[PDB]
Amino acid sequence: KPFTLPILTLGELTNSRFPLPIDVLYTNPNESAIVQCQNGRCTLDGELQGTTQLLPTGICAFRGKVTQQVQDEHRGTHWNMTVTNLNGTPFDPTEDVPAPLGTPDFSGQIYGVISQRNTNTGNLPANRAHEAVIATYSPKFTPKLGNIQFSTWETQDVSSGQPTKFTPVGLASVDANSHFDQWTLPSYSGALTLNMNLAPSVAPVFPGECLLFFRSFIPLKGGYGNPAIDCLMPQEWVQHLYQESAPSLSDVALVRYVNPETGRTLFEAKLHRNGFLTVARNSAGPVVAPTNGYFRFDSWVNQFYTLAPM
Amino acid sequence: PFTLPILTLGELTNSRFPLPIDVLYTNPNESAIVQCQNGRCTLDGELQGTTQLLPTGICAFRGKVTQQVQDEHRGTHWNMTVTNLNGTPFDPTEDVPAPLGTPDFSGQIYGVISQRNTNTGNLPANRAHEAVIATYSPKFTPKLGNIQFSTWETQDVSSGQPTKFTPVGLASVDANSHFDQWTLPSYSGALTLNMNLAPSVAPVFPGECLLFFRSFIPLKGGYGNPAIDCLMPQEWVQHLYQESAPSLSDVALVRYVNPETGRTLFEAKLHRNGFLTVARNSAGPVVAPTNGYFRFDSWVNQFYTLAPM
Ligand code: NA
Ligand code: NA
């Protein structure tokens, strides 16, 4: 069965690491961190890896139940919640995953809305929702152990023991004390435990090559900044590769970024078997390309193929 | 050949609001005309209504706040221009009901408005706040290129700055909230006729009813368990658009199969305009395992008799 990519333009793609549209292609060759994100991870033959799951609505979302308000030396109001699988079934910590699928894969203050619909009931249940922040770098962020902490501006109107949803929206802050680093993984089981079942790190092997990302800009609750989240493949590629399950015939698929109005190839890239792109580019920053362009699968090559410079 | 995605019920999301699919659902005694505008795609891949491909675009808006507006209603009110989701200006002369992704139902839609300033340690200022868009209000005029949203926040929204609306749920479904998932907004404002709509859908065969993909939608407060029903999940919209497969008749026979056992749980008609019917004589959820999925069987005609559900 032949390998294919979806025919979707940049303006028809979404980020696999946060619920955002793709804004631009992007490179950063001087990146010093190890790139090992856990969402948006899928091999070219369709094996999901890390915490990757198929629902766009599951990315950085949580489902569970608040157990109690908790004391914390930090300002604000703090709540403990158990976390289940996204479909509501209990999370099995013995499963071969780093954490419940969809768990955020980066260090930061993730901003969103906690909402609740009571189980007890004109026989209709009570509801509430409030802005909330989850600090994924905190020792209380232990989703692989089945529970996390979130905090609210609201000081009273969160109910214990009731079904709870976290809808992610953006970041609370990216200032110098906000610990935002998109390439630093959370410790899914806490500070004395090793992360397990991780999707592997990704890097260019060929000299002169760098990773190519699908970049989205992420909203902020306040403060200064222009934070972005870079994913290795958009969520629609994850979904396509999973459905097609096409055998990888070499370690590298050659792909070309095509302008369909004119038929010209703007650049070529290596699509690696583990699910990421490299290009021969010596510049950092966005790629200037029309959003009607798209990646086209051209051939299976090997790791020694020399890319045309970008 | 025509194909549907091999995605289980637990791998599908709603095309009318950013929610996972929770259950399949029927309501044969539904009195309203079903004419939703998101999640509309023919089997040969033509998007219709306000439907677009991005899961993040459903009930989302992009634009710029022009000013605070004075209004006798409680809260603080803001006018924003709306662009296409990709940032290009919305062309009101285009043959669409409204900007693609515009909500397709009457209610108080609850979400977060966020802004990142254009002017800049050479970094721009930001703010975000909870907000509500009342799609039934006379100030909801997305076909005219602008809408109003309201906030609890009384002052910290900036004029002239890029603005995003991220949908989250509903503010209320109480008796004064105008929530009705089958009542369209009046996209050009109050007392105006909608244009370029995706057509209404209905069962024509006796004994048949529509089959919906239902999601339960969060509430900011109050009592209720509101739900949003879509005709096809967003992943089907995306798949049909990619494939552009010729419809060999007006009706595809599909089977909902349990792959653990192999057995068909029920069959349904998948109509060319992008909706499902089943032969069922009861209202309510379909109690079925979420590991099942719809499989294309064959093209039939409008006179094919479905096995009862
Ligand atoms: Na993760
Ligand atoms: Na609409």
Side-chain angles (χ1 to χ4, degrees), chain A residues 1-64 66-70 72 74 76-120 122 124-204 206-260 262-281 283-302 304-310, chain B residues 1-5 7-28 30-69 71 73-93 96-203 205-259 261-262 264-271 273-301 304-309:
Chain A
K1 172 172 185 184
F3 174 80
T4 65
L5 293 167
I7 294 199
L8 291 167
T9 70
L10 277 191
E12 306 167 329
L13 299 170
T14 59
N15 205 289
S16 53
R17 296 185 60 218
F18 208 83
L20 310 162
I22 294 309
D23 291 304
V24 74
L25 296 168
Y26 176 89
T27 63
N28 182 17
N30 292 334
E31 178 63 62
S32 60
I34 288 151
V35 176
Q36 188 169 20
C37 49
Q38 296 301 304
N39 287 315
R41 300 303 304 271
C42 184
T43 67
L44 300 191
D45 53 33
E47 177 195 334
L48 305 181
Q49 303 194 322
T51 57
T52 300
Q53 49 79 59
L54 291 170
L55 303 179
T57 57
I59 303 166
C60 287
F62 287 114
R63 297 292 185 268
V66 172
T67 62
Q68 62 175 283
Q69 188 182 352
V70 300
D72 189 311
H74 302 94
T77 304
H78 318 291
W79 310 92
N80 181 262
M81 84 179 265
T82 62
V83 297
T84 62
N85 296 314
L86 287 163
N87 67 359
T89 61
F91 175 66
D92 182 5
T94 88
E95 196 151 46
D96 282 5
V97 298
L101 303 185
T103 296
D105 69 0
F106 60 94
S107 170
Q109 302 172 0
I110 298 187
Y111 161 71
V113 171
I114 281 287
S115 66
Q116 307 185 304
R117 178 151 310 157
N118 286 15
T119 52
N120 46 304
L124 293 167
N127 296 265
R128 65 217 57 83
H130 295 290
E131 293 171 290
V133 174
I134 297 169
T136 62
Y137 53 87
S138 155
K140 304 304 187 0
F141 185 77
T142 60
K144 173 73 170 179
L145 300 181
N147 78 104
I148 64 172
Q149 180 179 294
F150 66 84
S151 298
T152 56
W153 289 262
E154 167 62 35
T155 68
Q156 316 274 326
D157 187 43
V158 177
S159 297
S160 295
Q162 302 287 6
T164 304
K165 304 179 178 177
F166 177 76
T167 302
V169 174
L171 302 176
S173 174
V174 293
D175 70 11
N177 284 120
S178 74
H179 299 263
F180 175 54
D181 188 332
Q182 72 165 324
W183 301 129
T184 296
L185 291 176
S187 297
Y188 300 114
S189 292
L192 309 181
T193 307
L194 214 53
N195 288 337
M196 302 274 78
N197 309 109
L198 296 175
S201 61
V202 303
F206 204 96
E209 288 185 19
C210 65
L211 297 170
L212 179 66
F213 303 103
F214 301 78
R215 166 163 279 212
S216 306
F217 296 97
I218 182 164
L220 271 167
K221 172 66 182 177
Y224 296 89
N226 182 27
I229 298 291
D230 295 311
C231 67
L232 304 178
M233 296 186 312
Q235 184 68 9
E236 294 74 19
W237 287 24
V238 173
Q239 295 167 318
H240 182 82
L241 298 175
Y242 171 84
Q243 288 179 60
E244 290 296 288
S245 199
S248 302
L249 301 189
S250 81
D251 287 336
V252 177
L254 180 68
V255 302
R256 268 68 181 285
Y257 196 80
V258 171
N259 183 343
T262 76
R264 302 188 170 265
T265 281
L266 301 187
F267 64 92
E268 57 181 15
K270 290 177 173 169
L271 178 55
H272 295 259
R273 174 198 295 257
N274 271 358
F276 64 95
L277 295 160
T278 59
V279 292
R281 193 193 203 197
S283 310
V287 182
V288 179
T291 45
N292 78 324
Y294 59 93
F295 279 106
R296 177 189 75 200
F297 170 60
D298 274 0
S299 187
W300 293 104
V301 297
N302 58 57
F304 309 115
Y305 182 88
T306 298
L307 287 169
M310 249 187 88
Chain B
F2 178 81
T3 57
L4 293 167
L7 291 166
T8 70
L9 200 68
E11 304 166 330
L12 300 170
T13 59
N14 204 288
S15 53
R16 296 184 59 219
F17 209 81
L19 308 162
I21 295 310
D22 292 306
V23 74
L24 297 169
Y25 179 88
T26 62
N27 183 16
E30 177 64 62
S31 59
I33 288 151
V34 175
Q35 189 168 21
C36 49
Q37 297 301 304
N38 288 315
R40 300 302 303 271
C41 184
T42 66
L43 301 190
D44 51 43
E46 179 194 335
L47 304 181
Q48 302 194 321
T50 57
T51 301
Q52 48 78 60
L53 291 173
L54 302 178
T56 58
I58 302 166
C59 287
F61 287 113
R62 298 293 186 269
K64 281 195 175 172
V65 172
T66 62
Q67 63 175 284
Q68 189 186 355
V69 303
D71 190 312
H73 296 97
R74 66 186 183 267
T76 304
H77 316 291
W78 309 92
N79 180 263
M80 83 179 266
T81 62
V82 296
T83 62
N84 298 315
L85 286 163
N86 68 1
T88 61
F90 175 66
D91 180 4
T93 88
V96 299
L100 303 186
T102 297
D104 68 358
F105 61 93
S106 170
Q108 303 171 1
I109 299 187
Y110 161 71
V112 174
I113 281 287
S114 65
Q115 307 185 303
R116 177 152 309 158
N117 285 12
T118 55
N119 47 305
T120 60
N122 299 348
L123 294 167
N126 297 267
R127 64 217 57 84
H129 295 289
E130 293 172 290
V132 173
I133 296 167
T135 62
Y136 53 91
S137 154
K139 305 302 188 59
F140 187 76
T141 58
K143 172 72 170 179
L144 302 183
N146 75 104
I147 65 169
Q148 182 179 295
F149 65 84
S150 299
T151 56
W152 291 261
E153 168 63 36
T154 67
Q155 59 94 11
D156 186 43
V157 178
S158 298
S159 294
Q161 301 287 6
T163 303
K164 304 178 178 177
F165 178 76
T166 301
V168 173
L170 302 178
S172 172
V173 293
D174 71 11
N176 286 278
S177 76
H178 297 63
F179 175 53
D180 189 331
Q181 72 164 324
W182 301 127
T183 296
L184 289 175
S186 298
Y187 300 113
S188 290
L191 312 183
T192 64
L193 205 51
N194 289 335
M195 304 278 284
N196 308 110
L197 297 174
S200 60
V201 304
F205 205 96
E208 288 184 20
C209 64
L210 298 170
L211 179 67
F212 300 101
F213 302 77
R214 168 164 280 213
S215 306
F216 297 97
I217 182 165
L219 271 167
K220 172 67 182 177
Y223 296 90
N225 182 28
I228 300 292
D229 297 312
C230 68
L231 304 177
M232 296 186 312
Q234 184 69 10
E235 293 75 19
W236 286 23
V237 173
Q238 296 167 318
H239 184 81
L240 297 174
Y241 172 84
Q242 280 300 311
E243 292 296 289
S244 287
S247 303
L248 301 189
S249 80
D250 286 337
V251 179
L253 180 66
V254 301
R255 268 69 183 282
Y256 194 80
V257 308
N258 182 343
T261 75
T264 291
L265 301 185
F266 63 91
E267 60 184 19
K269 289 178 173 170
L270 180 54
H271 298 259
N273 266 339
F275 63 98
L276 293 162
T277 57
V278 291
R280 195 193 204 197
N281 197 30
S282 70
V286 182
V287 181
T290 46
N291 77 324
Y293 62 95
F294 281 102
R295 176 190 74 200
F296 171 64
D297 181 72
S298 52
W299 295 103
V300 297
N301 58 59
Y304 182 87
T305 299
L306 284 170
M309 220 189 89

PDB file of all heavy atoms in Angstrom, chain A residues 6 13 19 53 66 82 99 101-102 104-105 132 142 149 160 184 197 208 228 250 257 259 262 271 283 290:
ATOM      1  N   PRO A   6      -1.972  13.829   3.237  1.00  0.00           N
ATOM      2  CA  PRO A   6      -3.209  14.526   2.862  1.00  0.00           C
ATOM      3  C   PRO A   6      -2.888  15.719   1.974  1.00  0.00           C
ATOM      4  O   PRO A   6      -1.786  16.269   2.013  1.00  0.00           O
ATOM      5  CB  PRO A   6      -3.805  14.965   4.206  1.00  0.00           C
ATOM      6  CG  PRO A   6      -2.717  14.845   5.207  1.00  0.00           C
ATOM      7  CD  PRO A   6      -1.669  13.919   4.677  1.00  0.00           C
ATOM      8  N   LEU A  13      -4.489  23.156   8.224  1.00  0.00           N
ATOM      9  CA  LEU A  13      -3.800  22.306   9.193  1.00  0.00           C
ATOM     10  C   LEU A  13      -3.882  22.902  10.592  1.00  0.00           C
ATOM     11  O   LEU A  13      -3.912  24.128  10.765  1.00  0.00           O
ATOM     12  CB  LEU A  13      -2.331  22.124   8.823  1.00  0.00           C
ATOM     13  CG  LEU A  13      -2.034  21.460   7.479  1.00  0.00           C
ATOM     14  CD1 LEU A  13      -0.556  21.578   7.164  1.00  0.00           C
ATOM     15  CD2 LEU A  13      -2.465  19.987   7.524  1.00  0.00           C
ATOM     16  N   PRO A  19      -4.358  23.086  20.797  1.00  0.00           N
ATOM     17  CA  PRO A  19      -5.470  23.324  19.855  1.00  0.00           C
ATOM     18  C   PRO A  19      -5.425  24.689  19.182  1.00  0.00           C
ATOM     19  O   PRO A  19      -6.161  25.613  19.553  1.00  0.00           O
ATOM     20  CB  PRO A  19      -6.720  23.169  20.737  1.00  0.00           C
ATOM     21  CG  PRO A  19      -6.238  23.400  22.146  1.00  0.00           C
ATOM     22  CD  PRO A  19      -4.841  22.809  22.162  1.00  0.00           C
ATOM     23  N   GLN A  53      -2.849  11.132  20.744  1.00  0.00           N
ATOM     24  CA  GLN A  53      -4.137  10.513  20.469  1.00  0.00           C
ATOM     25  C   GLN A  53      -4.773  11.273  19.306  1.00  0.00           C
ATOM     26  O   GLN A  53      -4.222  12.268  18.814  1.00  0.00           O
ATOM     27  CB  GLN A  53      -5.011  10.484  21.735  1.00  0.00           C
ATOM     28  CG  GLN A  53      -5.102  11.806  22.489  1.00  0.00           C
ATOM     29  CD  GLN A  53      -6.073  12.767  21.836  1.00  0.00           C
ATOM     30  OE1 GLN A  53      -7.255  12.456  21.680  1.00  0.00           O
ATOM     31  NE2 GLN A  53      -5.571  13.917  21.405  1.00  0.00           N
ATOM     32  N   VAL A  66     -12.735  16.797  40.637  1.00  0.00           N
ATOM     33  CA  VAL A  66     -12.086  17.495  41.743  1.00  0.00           C
ATOM     34  C   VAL A  66     -12.271  16.683  43.019  1.00  0.00           C
ATOM     35  O   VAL A  66     -13.382  16.231  43.322  1.00  0.00           O
ATOM     36  CB  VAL A  66     -12.668  18.910  41.895  1.00  0.00           C
ATOM     37  CG1 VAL A  66     -12.138  19.581  43.161  1.00  0.00           C
ATOM     38  CG2 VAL A  66     -12.368  19.754  40.656  1.00  0.00           C
ATOM     39  N   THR A  82      -8.496  14.206  40.284  1.00  0.00           N
ATOM     40  CA  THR A  82      -8.096  12.970  39.640  1.00  0.00           C
ATOM     41  C   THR A  82      -8.261  13.134  38.137  1.00  0.00           C
ATOM     42  O   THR A  82      -9.126  13.874  37.668  1.00  0.00           O
ATOM     43  CB  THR A  82      -8.941  11.799  40.137  1.00  0.00           C
ATOM     44  OG1 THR A  82     -10.310  12.032  39.795  1.00  0.00           O
ATOM     45  CG2 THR A  82      -8.833  11.665  41.637  1.00  0.00           C
ATOM     46  N   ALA A  99       1.739   8.980  30.158  1.00  0.00           N
ATOM     47  CA  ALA A  99       0.722   9.704  30.906  1.00  0.00           C
ATOM     48  C   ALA A  99      -0.593   9.518  30.152  1.00  0.00           C
ATOM     49  O   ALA A  99      -0.578   8.965  29.046  1.00  0.00           O
ATOM     50  CB  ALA A  99       1.103  11.185  31.028  1.00  0.00           C
ATOM     51  N   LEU A 101      -3.320   9.923  27.517  1.00  0.00           N
ATOM     52  CA  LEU A 101      -3.138  10.501  26.189  1.00  0.00           C
ATOM     53  C   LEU A 101      -3.789  11.881  26.139  1.00  0.00           C
ATOM     54  O   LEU A 101      -4.858  12.101  26.719  1.00  0.00           O
ATOM     55  CB  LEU A 101      -3.717   9.575  25.114  1.00  0.00           C
ATOM     56  CG  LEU A 101      -3.171   8.138  25.073  1.00  0.00           C
ATOM     57  CD1 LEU A 101      -3.732   7.344  23.881  1.00  0.00           C
ATOM     58  CD2 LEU A 101      -1.641   8.099  25.070  1.00  0.00           C
ATOM     59  N   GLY A 102      -3.105  12.822  25.477  1.00  0.00           N
ATOM     60  CA  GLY A 102      -3.486  14.222  25.444  1.00  0.00           C
ATOM     61  C   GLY A 102      -2.845  15.092  26.512  1.00  0.00           C
ATOM     62  O   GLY A 102      -2.897  16.325  26.390  1.00  0.00           O
ATOM     63  N   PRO A 104      -0.532  17.517  28.378  1.00  0.00           N
ATOM     64  CA  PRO A 104       0.466  18.467  27.854  1.00  0.00           C
ATOM     65  C   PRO A 104       1.883  17.906  27.896  1.00  0.00           C
ATOM     66  O   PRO A 104       2.260  17.201  28.837  1.00  0.00           O
ATOM     67  CB  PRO A 104       0.327  19.671  28.793  1.00  0.00           C
ATOM     68  CG  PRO A 104      -1.064  19.599  29.313  1.00  0.00           C
ATOM     69  CD  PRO A 104      -1.380  18.124  29.421  1.00  0.00           C
ATOM     70  N   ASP A 105       2.693  18.260  26.887  1.00  0.00           N
ATOM     71  CA  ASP A 105       4.056  17.742  26.792  1.00  0.00           C
ATOM     72  C   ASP A 105       5.119  18.817  26.985  1.00  0.00           C
ATOM     73  O   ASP A 105       6.255  18.651  26.527  1.00  0.00           O
ATOM     74  CB  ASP A 105       4.267  17.024  25.451  1.00  0.00           C
ATOM     75  CG  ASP A 105       4.254  17.976  24.241  1.00  0.00           C
ATOM     76  OD1 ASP A 105       4.081  19.202  24.422  1.00  0.00           O
ATOM     77  OD2 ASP A 105       4.430  17.486  23.099  1.00  0.00           O
ATOM     78  N   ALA A 132      -8.785  28.796  34.735  1.00  0.00           N
ATOM     79  CA  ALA A 132      -7.899  28.006  35.573  1.00  0.00           C
ATOM     80  C   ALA A 132      -6.525  27.938  34.933  1.00  0.00           C
ATOM     81  O   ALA A 132      -6.367  28.152  33.728  1.00  0.00           O
ATOM     82  CB  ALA A 132      -8.450  26.594  35.800  1.00  0.00           C
ATOM     83  N   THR A 142       1.130  15.319  38.481  1.00  0.00           N
ATOM     84  CA  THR A 142       1.480  13.896  38.420  1.00  0.00           C
ATOM     85  C   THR A 142       0.417  13.115  37.650  1.00  0.00           C
ATOM     86  O   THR A 142      -0.203  12.190  38.187  1.00  0.00           O
ATOM     87  CB  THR A 142       1.674  13.316  39.823  1.00  0.00           C
ATOM     88  OG1 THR A 142       0.466  13.456  40.585  1.00  0.00           O
ATOM     89  CG2 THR A 142       2.817  14.035  40.547  1.00  0.00           C
ATOM     90  N   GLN A 149      -3.012  19.118  39.925  1.00  0.00           N
ATOM     91  CA  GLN A 149      -3.521  20.294  40.604  1.00  0.00           C
ATOM     92  C   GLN A 149      -3.746  21.406  39.590  1.00  0.00           C
ATOM     93  O   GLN A 149      -2.937  21.594  38.677  1.00  0.00           O
ATOM     94  CB  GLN A 149      -2.533  20.730  41.673  1.00  0.00           C
ATOM     95  CG  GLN A 149      -2.906  21.941  42.467  1.00  0.00           C
ATOM     96  CD  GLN A 149      -1.842  22.238  43.504  1.00  0.00           C
ATOM     97  OE1 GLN A 149      -1.641  21.456  44.443  1.00  0.00           O
ATOM     98  NE2 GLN A 149      -1.115  23.341  43.311  1.00  0.00           N
ATOM     99  N   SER A 160     -16.362  19.883  44.874  1.00  0.00           N
ATOM    100  CA  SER A 160     -15.629  18.641  45.063  1.00  0.00           C
ATOM    101  C   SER A 160     -16.494  17.454  44.661  1.00  0.00           C
ATOM    102  O   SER A 160     -17.713  17.460  44.842  1.00  0.00           O
ATOM    103  CB  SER A 160     -15.190  18.493  46.521  1.00  0.00           C
ATOM    104  OG  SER A 160     -14.254  19.503  46.864  1.00  0.00           O
ATOM    105  N   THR A 184      10.922  21.360  27.267  1.00  0.00           N
ATOM    106  CA  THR A 184      11.178  20.715  28.550  1.00  0.00           C
ATOM    107  C   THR A 184       9.945  19.895  28.904  1.00  0.00           C
ATOM    108  O   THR A 184       8.849  20.452  29.017  1.00  0.00           O
ATOM    109  CB  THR A 184      11.477  21.740  29.645  1.00  0.00           C
ATOM    110  OG1 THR A 184      12.684  22.449  29.327  1.00  0.00           O
ATOM    111  CG2 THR A 184      11.650  21.034  31.003  1.00  0.00           C
ATOM    112  N   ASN A 197       8.125   5.242  28.558  1.00  0.00           N
ATOM    113  CA  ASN A 197       7.400   4.992  27.305  1.00  0.00           C
ATOM    114  C   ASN A 197       7.397   6.219  26.397  1.00  0.00           C
ATOM    115  O   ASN A 197       6.439   6.461  25.653  1.00  0.00           O
ATOM    116  CB  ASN A 197       5.968   4.532  27.578  1.00  0.00           C
ATOM    117  CG  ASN A 197       5.909   3.379  28.557  1.00  0.00           C
ATOM    118  OD1 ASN A 197       5.482   3.542  29.699  1.00  0.00           O
ATOM    119  ND2 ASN A 197       6.334   2.207  28.116  1.00  0.00           N
ATOM    120  N   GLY A 208      24.366  20.116   7.968  1.00  0.00           N
ATOM    121  CA  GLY A 208      23.701  21.220   7.314  1.00  0.00           C
ATOM    122  C   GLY A 208      22.189  21.218   7.413  1.00  0.00           C
ATOM    123  O   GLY A 208      21.559  22.200   7.002  1.00  0.00           O
ATOM    124  N   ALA A 228       5.082  30.760  21.070  1.00  0.00           N
ATOM    125  CA  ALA A 228       4.698  29.864  19.996  1.00  0.00           C
ATOM    126  C   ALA A 228       4.897  28.418  20.438  1.00  0.00           C
ATOM    127  O   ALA A 228       5.721  28.123  21.306  1.00  0.00           O
ATOM    128  CB  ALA A 228       5.503  30.129  18.719  1.00  0.00           C
ATOM    129  N   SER A 250      11.482   3.057   3.201  1.00  0.00           N
ATOM    130  CA  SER A 250      12.843   3.374   3.609  1.00  0.00           C
ATOM    131  C   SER A 250      12.760   4.229   4.870  1.00  0.00           C
ATOM    132  O   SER A 250      11.679   4.439   5.428  1.00  0.00           O
ATOM    133  CB  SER A 250      13.611   4.084   2.491  1.00  0.00           C
ATOM    134  OG  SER A 250      13.266   5.458   2.478  1.00  0.00           O
ATOM    135  N   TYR A 257       7.406  20.909  -1.222  1.00  0.00           N
ATOM    136  CA  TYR A 257       6.378  21.898  -0.908  1.00  0.00           C
ATOM    137  C   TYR A 257       6.029  22.618  -2.205  1.00  0.00           C
ATOM    138  O   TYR A 257       6.881  23.289  -2.794  1.00  0.00           O
ATOM    139  CB  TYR A 257       6.860  22.876   0.160  1.00  0.00           C
ATOM    140  CG  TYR A 257       5.718  23.654   0.779  1.00  0.00           C
ATOM    141  CD1 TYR A 257       4.937  23.078   1.772  1.00  0.00           C
ATOM    142  CD2 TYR A 257       5.400  24.936   0.354  1.00  0.00           C
ATOM    143  CE1 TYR A 257       3.889  23.750   2.334  1.00  0.00           C
ATOM    144  CE2 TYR A 257       4.342  25.628   0.922  1.00  0.00           C
ATOM    145  CZ  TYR A 257       3.596  25.024   1.914  1.00  0.00           C
ATOM    146  OH  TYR A 257       2.534  25.674   2.494  1.00  0.00           O
ATOM    147  N   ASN A 259       3.600  24.950  -4.912  1.00  0.00           N
ATOM    148  CA  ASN A 259       2.610  25.995  -5.122  1.00  0.00           C
ATOM    149  C   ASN A 259       1.693  25.505  -6.231  1.00  0.00           C
ATOM    150  O   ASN A 259       2.111  25.480  -7.398  1.00  0.00           O
ATOM    151  CB  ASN A 259       3.282  27.312  -5.509  1.00  0.00           C
ATOM    152  CG  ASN A 259       2.293  28.462  -5.676  1.00  0.00           C
ATOM    153  OD1 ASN A 259       1.086  28.260  -5.824  1.00  0.00           O
ATOM    154  ND2 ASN A 259       2.816  29.681  -5.664  1.00  0.00           N
ATOM    155  N   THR A 262       0.912  27.585  -9.691  1.00  0.00           N
ATOM    156  CA  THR A 262       1.935  27.656 -10.724  1.00  0.00           C
ATOM    157  C   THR A 262       2.587  26.316 -11.029  1.00  0.00           C
ATOM    158  O   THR A 262       3.074  26.113 -12.145  1.00  0.00           O
ATOM    159  CB  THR A 262       3.023  28.648 -10.304  1.00  0.00           C
ATOM    160  OG1 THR A 262       3.854  28.037  -9.312  1.00  0.00           O
ATOM    161  CG2 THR A 262       2.389  29.887  -9.703  1.00  0.00           C
ATOM    162  N   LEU A 271      11.131  13.657   5.048  1.00  0.00           N
ATOM    163  CA  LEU A 271      10.139  13.235   6.029  1.00  0.00           C
ATOM    164  C   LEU A 271      10.637  11.918   6.608  1.00  0.00           C
ATOM    165  O   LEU A 271      10.611  10.880   5.934  1.00  0.00           O
ATOM    166  CB  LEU A 271       8.749  13.105   5.406  1.00  0.00           C
ATOM    167  CG  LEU A 271       7.617  12.626   6.323  1.00  0.00           C
ATOM    168  CD1 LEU A 271       7.490  13.506   7.575  1.00  0.00           C
ATOM    169  CD2 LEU A 271       6.307  12.613   5.552  1.00  0.00           C
ATOM    170  N   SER A 283      19.011  29.332   8.123  1.00  0.00           N
ATOM    171  CA  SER A 283      18.361  30.511   8.672  1.00  0.00           C
ATOM    172  C   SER A 283      17.337  30.080   9.708  1.00  0.00           C
ATOM    173  O   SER A 283      16.702  29.028   9.587  1.00  0.00           O
ATOM    174  CB  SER A 283      17.653  31.340   7.581  1.00  0.00           C
ATOM    175  OG  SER A 283      18.505  31.603   6.472  1.00  0.00           O
ATOM    176  N   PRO A 290       3.263  30.652   0.375  1.00  0.00           N
ATOM    177  CA  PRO A 290       1.821  30.912   0.306  1.00  0.00           C
ATOM    178  C   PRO A 290       1.054  29.818   1.028  1.00  0.00           C
ATOM    179  O   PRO A 290       1.415  28.640   0.967  1.00  0.00           O
ATOM    180  CB  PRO A 290       1.529  30.914  -1.198  1.00  0.00           C
ATOM    181  CG  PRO A 290       2.627  30.095  -1.800  1.00  0.00           C
ATOM    182  CD  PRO A 290       3.837  30.298  -0.937  1.00  0.00           C
TER     183      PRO A 290
END
